[PDB]
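Appendix B: complex inputs.
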Amino acid sequence: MFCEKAMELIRELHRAPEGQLPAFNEDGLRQVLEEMKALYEQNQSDVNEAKSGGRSDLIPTIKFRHCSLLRNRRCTVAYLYDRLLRIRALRWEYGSVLPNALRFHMAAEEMEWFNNYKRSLATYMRSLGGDEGLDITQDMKPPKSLYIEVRCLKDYGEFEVDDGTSVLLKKNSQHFLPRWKCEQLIRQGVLEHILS
Amino acid sequence: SEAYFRVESGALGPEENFLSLDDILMSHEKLPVRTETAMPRLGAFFNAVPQGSKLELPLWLAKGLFDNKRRILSVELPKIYQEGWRTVFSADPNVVDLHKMGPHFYGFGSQLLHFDSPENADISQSLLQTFIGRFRRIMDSSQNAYNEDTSALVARLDEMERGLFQTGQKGLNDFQCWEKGQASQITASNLVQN
Amino acid sequence: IGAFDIPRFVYNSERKKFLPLLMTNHPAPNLFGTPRDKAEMFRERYTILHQRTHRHELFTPPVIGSHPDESGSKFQLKTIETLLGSTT
Amino acid sequence: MDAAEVEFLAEKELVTIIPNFSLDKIYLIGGDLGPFNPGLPVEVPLWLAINLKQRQKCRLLPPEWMDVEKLEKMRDHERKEETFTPMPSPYYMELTKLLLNHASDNIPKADEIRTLVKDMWDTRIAKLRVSADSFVRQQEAHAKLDNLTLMEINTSGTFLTQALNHMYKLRTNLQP
Amino acid sequence: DIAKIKKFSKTRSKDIFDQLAKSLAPSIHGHDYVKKAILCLLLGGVERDLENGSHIRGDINILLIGDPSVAKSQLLRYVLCTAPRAIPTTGRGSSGVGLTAAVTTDQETGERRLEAGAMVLADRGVVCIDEFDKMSDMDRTAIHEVMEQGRVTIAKAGIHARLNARCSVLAAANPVYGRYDQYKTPMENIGLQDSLLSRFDLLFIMLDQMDPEQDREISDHVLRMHRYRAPGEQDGDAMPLGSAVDILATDDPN
Ligand SMILES: Nc1ncnc2c1ncn2[C@@H]1O[C@H](COP(=O)(O)OP(=O)(O)NP(=O)(O)O)[C@@H](O)[C@H]1O
Ligand SMILES: [Mg+2]
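Resulting structure:
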């Protein structure tokens, strides 16, 4: 039966409801496109036969293959769109430079879309204020204390806090720093907020 | 705020959502039909498929081929939506297994209504009353199963009901984390696993 | 570009594509090869030729192809493990 | 909306503190506060009060409604009535948590206050459960929930609203 | 627990017996003649009573002697699953008393009385005896009377009586030495005595021939069966343990 290969893409995405991005199914997309090509060629031959030859009984089969083509298009578009939704979520969940192990899951065109989305979002944030914009990626949770105590999880390098001052993010060192400075690193897992 | 959310299901509405994975999976499930006209070359899949032949084919294909005067094919309801099983639902909705009989019981049943069956009214009332019967137990189990194994509660629920169950669980866990003071901490996102 | 400078890619059969040596879990080449490497030589030669051949006119029927379409015959490759038994 | 956001709105409520520091009137965007005189009461928002308590810069006083007899009367009235009774604050649960967790030393009979507020919370959540069940059973299209607080709604409202959306579509699927 | 479909079937089909026999046990490949014989066992002969009081049974008795893993047990289990009043039995799990009838005391009263055994319960039905070679001869003494005369005679409790046991027997056995030996006669590969073997209408020898052609098609069928999954079940589901899933006194889908 037709359109069974289209379901594999959909099931792959559906069985990861957590929002993680699987590897792009290049060959599955290729196979469904080839199925659409075969369907279209058969329908071209049959519609030519039905019109030029006047053969009327082929019309149900014409409608059959056309419906199958529509189904395959729907599945392809839905798969690509849900992958775009997950990729869009990654910018807010993690940051701008995605980890390499995750970048290898993305298609080249997906990376192009993500770069365009990052550029457009940066433009929008830049256009909000009088100057220097508003980073609406920050303040994701309501503010409690102005300063927080944070613990280094990774051996990061140095991290500037004022114009002339920086903290060395060596593992297990603890720093008492502004929340608005530490939020992105905590989000990315470099730092751990250590009061609860 | 900016978390990932899939496209929501539109299967209970007049038409299903184009980009919804749930609706796509729901419409893949097979529907019994009878061919009202012969279909050349189609015997390769099921030579022509003869006129009057009984088939079970996907709901998407049946909706594509169907028309209100039944030229290509005519549709039979699945047995779970016929009068026999409607009576079982009417007996007690809380004991039936809509995961076996679905897992998209309500969505599939709602989409059957577009085939102009004479018992559309009975189907609609059955779906509505099944939901009304199962609401209280979905609410209680979702909002009062805390920090335990919910698989026994979730086993017999259809996908719509399971979505509602997870919503109730989210509310419960959110309030409990707030009450215990765990909502204050700033945390690495779920992508920190890699 | 010297021969020892050439980068290595491995053909993943279940993704049907070439992946870098940095991405696969394959060990790095060394001069004193292991027993596995000697097998992998000829297995990889076969692999390249196999994937190349299956994408020529010896490709799928296709499974959608029907009889009036695909009225003409097409080759179908077999492996040695398949020809023993009822295939005699 | 998160419970933390409900707490953020609860944090805007005004409470009385007794500073141990001297500070002139401060002209915040959301309205001016002070002057802060040592040893005298001054009324400030709850976020500021909690921050000053954490920094040891003031003594927090209980609100007028945090009294055991008043809370017992309100609890008994809630248990007797069928509808939600008017609450002493629109964010009473959040107020109770914040004030008693950060200032139990200042607030006497804090155990009794916490238990009574817990009693009122349990009664009102039970009433809300009854309301949801009645809505779905009788197939209502509208309900009146006058004295519910935001935290009480937010505990159950997402689930309830999703269920009612599904119910509406199920009872209107034959419309065309 | 109408006739038009059956009438159309018998008139439309050519050799409906063959179609029924090959459709009988789909999950077992081959064994076409054994499937035909089991279909004959299911349909039964006709019971004849003559003017002189002499009697001929209608029941058909089949014995399967064979190598390990030739689906004897699965054929017996199919007949157990599909025939009406098919009673399971195994050689070591049963006794003569349990095969025929036991004295038990009515807990209501306290009086001793008979309680029917497997072959008595199988009257006008089938008894499927797996591991038939593992059974004791003292237990098979009862089977002699049941197969020969369609009855079992008892003298126990207050009662000396002739119980009806008009059942077909579908027996499965291994040859002695486990695997059938080509370099020994069939009557010494079959460990049972000819007096007992006379009772069975049909006696099939089932050998695990290692022909690669039959191995290929059999393994293809077996792997297809192991790849099957039910329609109401997800791809990763483990098999559920049973429950009271019947929730109407009559069947709902039909
Ligand atoms: N021809 C066959 N086709 C399909 N499955 C088979 C076949 N032969 C054996 N099997 C499988 O092999 C397994 C064992 O079959 P079984 O019913 O025990 O045969 P058996 O001869 O009665 N075993 P045993 O009691 O030792 O003699 C089952 O899972 C059968 O389905
Ligand atoms: Mg056996």
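The CA atoms of residues 1 and 7 of chain C lie 10 Å apart.
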